[PDB]
Amino acid sequence: SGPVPSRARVYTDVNTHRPREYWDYESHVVEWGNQDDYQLVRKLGRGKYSEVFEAINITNNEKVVVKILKPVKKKKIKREIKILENLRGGPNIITLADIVKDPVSRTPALVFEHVNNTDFKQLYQTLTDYDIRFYMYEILKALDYCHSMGIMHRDVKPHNVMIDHEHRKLRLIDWGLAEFYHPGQEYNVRVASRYFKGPELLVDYQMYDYSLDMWSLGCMLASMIFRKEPFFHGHDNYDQLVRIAKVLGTEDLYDYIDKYNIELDPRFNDILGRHSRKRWERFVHSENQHLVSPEALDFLDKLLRYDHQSRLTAREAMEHPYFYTVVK
Ligand SMILES: Nc1ncnc2c1ncn2[C@@H]1O[C@H](COP(=O)(O)OP(=O)(O)NP(=O)(O)O)[C@@H](O)[C@H]1O
Numbered sequence: 001s002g003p004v005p006s007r008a009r010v011y012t013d014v015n016t017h018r019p020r021e022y023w024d025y026e027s028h029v030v031e032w033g034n035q036d037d038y039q040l041v042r043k044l045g046r047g048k049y050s051e052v053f054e055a056i057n058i059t060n061n062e063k064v065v066v067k068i069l070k071p072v073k074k075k076k077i078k079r080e081i082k083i084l085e086n087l088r089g090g091p092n093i094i095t096l097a098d099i100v101k102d103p104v105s106r107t108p109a110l111v112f113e114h115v116n117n118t119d120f121k122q123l124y125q126t127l128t129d130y131d132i133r134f135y136m137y138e139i140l141k142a143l144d145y146c147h148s149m150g151i152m153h154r155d156v157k158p159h160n161v162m163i164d165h166e167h168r169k170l171r172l173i174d175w176g177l178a179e180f181y182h183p184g185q186e187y188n189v190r191v192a193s194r195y196f197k198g199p200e201l202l203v204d205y206q207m208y209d210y211s212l213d214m215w216s217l218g219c220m221l222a223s224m225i226f227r228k229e230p231f232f233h234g235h236d237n238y239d240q241l242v243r244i245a246k247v248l249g250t251e252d253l254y255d256y257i258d259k260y261n262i263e264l265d266p267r268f269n270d271i272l273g274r275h276s277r278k279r280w281e282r283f284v285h286s287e288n289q290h291l292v293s294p295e296a297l298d299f300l301d302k303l304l305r306y307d308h309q310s311r312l313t314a315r316e317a318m319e320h321p322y323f324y325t326v327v328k
Pocket of ligand 1: 047048052053065112113116159174
């Protein structure tokens with residue numbers, strides 16, 4: 001029989017009305033810049049797929065960020081490049097300034113605009129109620145834009161949000177896990193970082209959509225307003241679902257899997273237990289009360305739903321009373 005199919009409730013067929021070239025990233029021909037324009041200054045770190053450097057563009061004297069891609073999962077390289085080009089200029093989307101071949105690695109190196117970020121661990125401790133609202137609204141601008149352009153980010157988390165708090169400026173970065181949304185398409189569930197993974201990923205439901213990003217944003221919101229980092233603190237991908245079930249309850253979880261004719265991994269049988277849905281007030285205390293309001297709680301509740309179809313869209317989120325106090 002198999003799982004019941006799903007489609008996005010918004011921007012469903014945006015890519016089908018595009019030229020093939022827009023989404024067929026495999027056919028994309030990279031336009032290469034000159035590597036000698038960029039002088040590496042220091043290494044900022046490296047992940048699974050790349051090494052990241054602060055650099056200078058010696059032609060304009062500007063600071064840039066250079067991500068030198070490792071020679072692996074090369075399908076991702078043209079996918080990221082194409083998405084960055086498609087989204088360039090969009091609200092709060094990081095700007096790809098250049099693509100060059102690194103002489104040492106012989107691999108593509110992506111050159112981005114510099115953004116003056118502060119450690120989210122340090123920064124979130126300082127955010128006022130107003131600032132959480134403000135920056136949430138800025139993230140939503142980015143998400144509604146990429147979703148409208150037929151793209152899901154799939155790795156929304158604090159590390160992928162660069163905030164210049166001095167200039168009240170925000171950019172959504174690291175589009176290397178991003179994909180084009182095509183209705184009916186089955187996607188890899190091995191995306192997002194543990195604490196930000198949606199229930200759809202955790203129960204191995206492949207026919208997911210933009211709404212994945214909205215769960216991830218809800219996890220961010222919960223962590224900020226409740227000052228609990230992370231909000232859902234799983235030991236592994238299985239315990240992650242259990243942590244979610246302890247807040248949202250097991251009956252709505254079983255209703256979700258029943259709706260999509262999904263079968264839980266049988267290892268959950270002995271660890272999931274039975275849990276009531278909690279009221280969001282359970283998580284409020286003297287130290288976080290100033291960040292919590294009825295509006296915040298209602299908005300959070302509408303993001304953190306098991307059913308990906310039930311979650312607020314980015315545009316719906318922007319309509320929420322929580323943002324009425326934020327100056328437009
Ligand atoms: N557009 C940008 N402007 C300024 N700094 C950036 C930009 N993009 C990334 N960085 C910085 O570069 C550093 C490393 O980049 P990133 O690609 O996230 O590697 P990473 O953090 O090692 N990945 P992981 O170890 O898997 O979490 C981060 O700490 C960022 O602060």
